[PDB]
Ligand binder design. Structure first.
Ligand SMILES: *[C@@H]1O[C@H](CO)[C@@H](O[C@@H]2O[C@H](CO)[C@@H](O[C@@H]3O[C@H](CO)[C@@H](O)[C@H](O[C@H]4O[C@H](CO)[C@@H](O)[C@H](O)[C@@H]4O[C@@H]4O[C@H](CO)[C@@H](O)[C@H](O)[C@H]4NC(C)=O)[C@@H]3O)[C@H](O)[C@H]2NC(C)=O)[C@H](O)[C@H]1NC(C)=O
Ligand SMILES: *[C@@H]1O[C@H](CO)[C@@H](O[C@@H]2O[C@H](CO)[C@@H](O[C@@H]3O[C@H](CO)[C@@H](O)[C@H](O[C@H]4O[C@H](CO)[C@@H](O)[C@H](O)[C@@H]4O)[C@@H]3O)[C@H](O)[C@H]2NC(C)=O)[C@H](O)[C@H]1NC(C)=O
Ligand SMILES: *[C@@H]1O[C@H](CO[C@@H]2O[C@@H](C)[C@@H](O)[C@@H](O)[C@@H]2O)[C@@H](O[C@@H]2O[C@H](CO)[C@@H](O[C@@H]3O[C@H](CO)[C@@H](O)[C@H](O)[C@@H]3O)[C@H](O)[C@H]2NC(C)=O)[C@H](O)[C@H]1NC(C)=O
Lengths: 439, 49
């Protein structure tokens, strides 16, 4: 049998569905999402890491003039300084006191640490949604795992499942993302080959093992100090390190809808957005005929306690007279109250206890125990606790529905107003008829 | 659950209060003041003899 249903995306909240196949006993299916994963398709844009400045030894040409040639190194800078008179530990390097020159050359390379410490700049594409679902099938807990795209049906215990597509395509990852080790950041990284000094992306490479390194670190060689052989330079510090110190909070802590973020691969887990269409092909063997299944009559309901505490704070007792021993499926005929149990045992004339959760100030519902609807209603009390660590097990408030059954004040006041309106309208009609009659 | 009540100061007469917590069976507490002692704090003025 094909049953189609829609369940909210909230993870950890079981949901009850009626499989109502005419001629067969009604069935109640409990389905609960254990994990919903959005894994976007990532295309590696590039890699950022820490650079190292390679500076060969300076060339001191004295009694002469030095010169250098342009090279094709990533960020190569070369210069010649005149009038230098360097000293070594033993004294002056060489005799001629002037007209000496120093050749200073340096370049930027990606450090070996780029193999280990790096940030991967990715582009994000459509997300391959996947889901894990627990189903209470005929009293047995079954687990399914399927891609939520309206395809890839999974068959367990001869029951076939198709899941998705997502009712909302919202994903916490935007087009451009950055992954460092396990933290995913949303930033508009600079295009490859157009990095800026001192910021994220000053040094870039297509892959960690690639030898193509683009570097824009604003490397300017400076004049060495008098009497020294050092090679000074004014270079913007590593933008990767500055980003590391100034990362801020990743998506793991700032994602909307309570999404969790994992890496390797990059996954968005448990995003409570939208809802899920679920279609179940049910084997015919699972159904039981109406005449074969037990029938209950002369049944009543009483609620000893009701508290809209969001953890099944209400408990009801239903007295029943069962035709014979068997298994039936309790279901609530209204959305405002939800029943914890899906199936009760019945035998002769006895009573069964059910647990339910609601937001109503006065519970009024009709429980369909087994092809039989019993009206159950009673007062409910507010809980004393203010905050809990679990999501509300019942449904939303609903407009005007949760009006407590002491709103008879509203009915009485509106009845009095309608009474004065009706009396006044009767008076007006009488006088109008009299005046029309008079000529 | 915090229950607040008032009992007369008479000694030896038990009084009963109904702790009514919704969703639970009513409870009845009988409390009796066996001894109430007022001990003033004394500053000795002097000694006569
Ligand atoms: C037969 O039986 C009788 C009855 O018991 C006995 O009498 C008792 O004698 C005791 C010995 O003198 C009394 O005990 C104490 O004696 C102290 C002697 O120095 C005296 O100083 C005591 O008084 C201080 O302590 C009291 C208890 O703490 C306080 O209530 C009192 O106010 C005093 O406290 C001081 O108060 C001033 C106020 O200005 C403060 O400035 C001080 O800082 C306080 N100091 C302290 C330390 O608190 C106390 O009298 C005993 O009281 C007494 N019985 C009664 C009922 O009074 C006979 O002795 C016994 N026969 C024999 C042979 O022993
Ligand atoms: C330290 O631990 C971290 C994570 O725990 C780990 O980071 C990973 O580094 C590798 C590089 O060795 C990255 O690349 C992966 O390596 C496998 C090796 O089997 C390759 O198959 C892949 O590399 C390709 O992947 C790109 C995806 O498009 C290709 O386009 C490109 O050509 C790459 O060659 C695979 O991705 C890996 O991505 C990271 N992981 C993360 C989450 O960033 C690191 O390797 C560990 N070791 C060291 C020494 O740091
Ligand atoms: C089918 O599975 C549901 C829920 O799925 C469960 O999820 C985890 C909690 C793991 O236990 C999984 O193995 C399991 O599939 C079961 O319902 C849950 O059963 C547990 C039993 O341990 C209930 O815990 C109890 O809760 C009461 C009241 O709080 C405590 O006093 C107990 O000490 C115990 O902790 C849990 O409340 C219940 N959840 C519901 C009903 O929503 C179900 O029992 C299981 N059925 C079968 C036939 O396998």
């Amino acid at each position: 049998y094909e049953h189609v249903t829609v369940i909210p995306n909230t993870v950890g909240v079981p949901y009850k569905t009626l499989v109502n196949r005419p001629g067969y006993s009604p069935m109640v299916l409990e389905m609960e999402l254990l994990s919903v994963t959005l894994e976007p398709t990532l295309s590696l844009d590039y890699i950022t890491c820490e650079y190292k400045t390679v500076i060969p030894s300076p060339y001191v040409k004295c009694c002469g003039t030095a010169e250098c040639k342009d090279k094709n190194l990533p960020d190569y800078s070369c210069k010649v300084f005149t009038g230098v008179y360097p000293f070594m530990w033993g004294g002056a390097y060489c005799f001629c006191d002037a007209e000496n020159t120093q050749l200073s050359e340096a370049h930027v390379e990606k450090s070996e640490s780029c193999k280990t410490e790096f940030a991967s700049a990715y582009r994000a594409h459509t997300a391959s949604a996947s889901a894990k679902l627990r189903v209470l099938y005929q009293g047995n807990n079954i687990t399914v795992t399927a891609y939520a795209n309206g395809d890839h049906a999974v068959t367990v215990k001869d029951a076939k499942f198709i899941v998705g597509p997502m009712s909302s395509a919202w994903t916490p990852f935007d087009n451009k993302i950055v992954v460092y080790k396990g933290d995913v950041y949303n930033m508009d990284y600079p295009p490859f080959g157009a990095g800026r000094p001192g910021q994220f992306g000053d040094i870039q490479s297509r892959t960690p093992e690639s030898k193509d390194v683009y570097a824009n670190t604003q490397l300017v060689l400076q004049r060495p100090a008098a009497g020294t052989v050092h090679v000074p330079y004014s270079q913007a510090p590593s933008g990767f390190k500055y980003w590391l110190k100034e990362r801020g909070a990743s998506l793991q802590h700032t994602a909307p809808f309570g999404c969790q973020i994992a890496t390797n691969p990059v996954r968005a887990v448990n995003c409570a957005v939208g809802n899920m269409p679920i279609s179940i092909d049910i084997p015919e063997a699972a159904f039981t005929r109406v005449v074969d299944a037990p029938s209950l009559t002369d049944m009543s309901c009483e609620v000893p306690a009701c508290t809209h505490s969001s953890d099944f704070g209400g408990v009801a007792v239903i007295k029943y007279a069962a035709s014979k021993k068997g298994k039936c499926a309790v279901h609530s005929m209204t959305n405002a109250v939800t029943i914890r149990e899906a199936e009760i045992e019945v035998e002769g004339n006895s009573q069964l206890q059910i647990s339910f959760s609601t937001a109503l100030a006065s519970a009024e519902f009709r429980v369909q125990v087994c092809s039989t609807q019993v009206h159950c209603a009673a007062e409910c009390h507010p809980p004393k606790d203010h905050i809990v660590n679990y999501p509300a097990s019942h449904t939303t408030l609903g407009v005007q529905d949760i009006s407590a059954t002491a709103m008879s004040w509203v009915q009485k006041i509106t009845g009095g107003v309608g009474l004065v309106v009706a009396v006044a309208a009767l008076i007006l009609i009488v006088v109008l008829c009299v005046s029309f009659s008079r000529h």
